[PDB]
Amino acid sequence: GSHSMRYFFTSVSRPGRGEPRFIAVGYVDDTQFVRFDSDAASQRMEPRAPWIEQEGPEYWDGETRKVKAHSQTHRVDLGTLRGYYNQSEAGSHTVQRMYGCDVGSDWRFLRGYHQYAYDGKDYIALKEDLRSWTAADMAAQTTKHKWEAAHVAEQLRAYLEGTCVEWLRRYLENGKETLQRTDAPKTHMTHHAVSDHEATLRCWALSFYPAEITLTWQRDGEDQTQDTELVETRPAGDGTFQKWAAVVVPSGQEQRYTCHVQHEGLPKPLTLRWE
């Protein structure tokens, strides 16, 4: 289909003793496939999907080297940023980094990104042109001048347009049985009386993949948002996702209300009614 590869990195300083906590995870679409945790025993990049286990020792050696290199860069950054912001050595602080690439249905490059945050706020990010930088404040502006002088965007662009896309295609082929399979939502409706004259109708979407989905309620054929509740999409724990939407209705009028489900795995949207 249309696809993405993304890596996520978090480093948290520990001022009382020792090095920061460092956690890295890699995804293809909504499927985690590698991880590194500085608290874990292996001290290696580890597989988390079957289709990555076939990569050879050179793969795992190189990804371990690179992810440890990311970890030490973040360790340095935490010290540098404490200085840029004139902060004490007493408190814990956080660096986060996300980067990756999107490809279309034809597996051609669509866009790339690289975003960096300090203490949960934008710090510096690569613009969509893959040449320029967005600096949120004057500390990040110092970083921007440094990365300009060192040609960083050039080699990041080369990675995002090349290596990133090329290995994404490789993973998509090796894991095609799941990564290129859509799991349409399994849907049903429940009914929960709230009094002797009104009731909650809850529309369920279960066991679907990928995570993107839209659930909407209609009354007599027109969208309704009054008296509705929509929960955040949530992981089932087996690689699929769940969501529900509910509406409160006068008892006996349930047939006016329809739940509409849109998902990449559905050729046409589904309609559900209570009966």
């Binding site: 690179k66 290199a69 990311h70 950054d77 440094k146 960083v152 990041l156 990133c164």
Partner: peptide, 9 residues
Amino acid sequence: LLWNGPMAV
């Protein structure tokens, strides 16, 4: 595959 060239801020 990871990027091989992150630079410090």
